[PDB]
Amino acid sequence: DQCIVNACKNSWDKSYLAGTPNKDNCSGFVQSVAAELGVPMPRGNANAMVDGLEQSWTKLASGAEAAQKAAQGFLVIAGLKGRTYGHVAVVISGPLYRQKYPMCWSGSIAGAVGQSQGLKSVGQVWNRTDRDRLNYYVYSLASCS
Amino acid sequence: LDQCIVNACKNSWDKSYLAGTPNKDNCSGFVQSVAAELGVPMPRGNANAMVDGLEQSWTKLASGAEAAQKAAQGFLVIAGLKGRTYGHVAVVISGPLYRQKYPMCWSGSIAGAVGQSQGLKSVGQVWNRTDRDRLNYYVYSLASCS
């Protein structure tokens, strides 16, 4: 998964949207990760992205499987629609927080409380309710060799 | 004539298509919220991505003059131009052209007032004098108003 962690580190410093650092934009951060890895990604805000992922990407059964696919070099997106705004993040390999939630990178307009540079799990980026409703989507071709 | 489109623009000015990002400060999000209000499917993404999608699936008008009269007939018309780093999109509205060339528009912009229009600037005043003559005008297949 080093190729995905590298794309995450590089995306953290780019601005998918004009004038908008990806660290402050959860949908744009994922778009730049996918663009660096050559993976087609559904476009728009987080809700629109999750709709698009649900339609065309493989949905995994668990956060444990999300971590395993990431460990096998696949781009894995954690996503959850919201009543007003959804959220997406990139899952990376690593031990599951609370033996359930995989590690991730995420941008966020909300600031550091919604951001992760690989040291928080999705269970620490999403609230104690939303984290068990998350969906994990995987792209069908490995990116890292 | 284009009142339903001008109303959508006014309503979208105060919305936030992207979390935490007012549409007046986000040219791509401003256009998404206008289209959503009108019920019009719109290519998504940043401005460059939107222009890509418009270029592939919307009818391209021949002139800014043609854009204003299609807007006057109630069609959603998007002015768009790709950039080397970032592109730009805006909603064309009816009204007399600026310098007999550039239709009036609404536009959000992260650049602030320079790139913004609430209907009193033409596309020739939000884009610089270089780009304003290279803009494309994309019209939807169905009229949204009446």
Numbering used by the authors:
A (entry chain A): 5 to 149
B (entry chain B): 4 to 149
From the manuscript:
Members of the bacterial T6SS amidase effector (Tae) superfamily of toxins are delivered between competing bacteria to degrade cell wall peptidoglycan. We focused on Tae1 (previously known as Tse1) from the common soil bacterium Pseudomonas aeruginosa, which is known to interact with a wide range of microbes, including E. coli. The taes encode hydrolase enzymes that induce recipient cell lysis by breaking down the major structural component of bacterial cell envelopes, PG. Furthermore, Tae1 injected into nearby kin cells is deactivated through binding by a cognate immunity protein, T6S amidase immunity protein 1 (Tai1), preventing lysis.
We were particularly struck by one variant, Tae1C110S, which is modified at a partially buried residue sitting directly behind the catalytic Cys30 site. The Cys110Ser substitution was the top-scoring GOF variant in the D-Met screen and ranked 11th amongst GOF variants in the M9 screen. Using the E. coli lysis assay, we first confirmed that Tae1C110S indeed lysed cells at a faster rate than Tae1WT in cells grown in both D-Met and M9 minimal media. We did not observe any major structural rearrangements that would immediately implicate distinct modes of Tai1PA-binding (RMSD = 0.746). However, we did observe some key side chain alterations near the Tae1C110S active site, which is the enzyme region most intimately engaged with Tai1PA upon binding. Most notably, we found that His91 protruded away from the active site of Tae1C110S, which would sterically clash with a loop of Tai1PA that typically inserts into the catalytic cleft. Our structural observations are consistent with the hypothesis that the Cys110 position is important for Tai1 recognition; therefore, serine at this position in P. aeruginosa may be disfavored to preserve immunity to the toxin. We measured Tai1-binding affinity (Kd) for recombinant Tae1WT and Tae1C110S proteins by isothermal titration calorimetry and found that Tae1WT bound Tai1 with ~36-fold greater affinity than Tae1C110S (9.5 nM Kd and 349.6 nM Kd, respectively). Indeed, for PAC110S we observed substantially reduced growth compared to PAWT on solid media but not in liquid media, where T6S is not induced. This phenotype strongly suggests that Tae1C110S lyses kin cells at a faster rate than Tai1 can bind and inhibit killing, leading to a fitness cost for this strain.
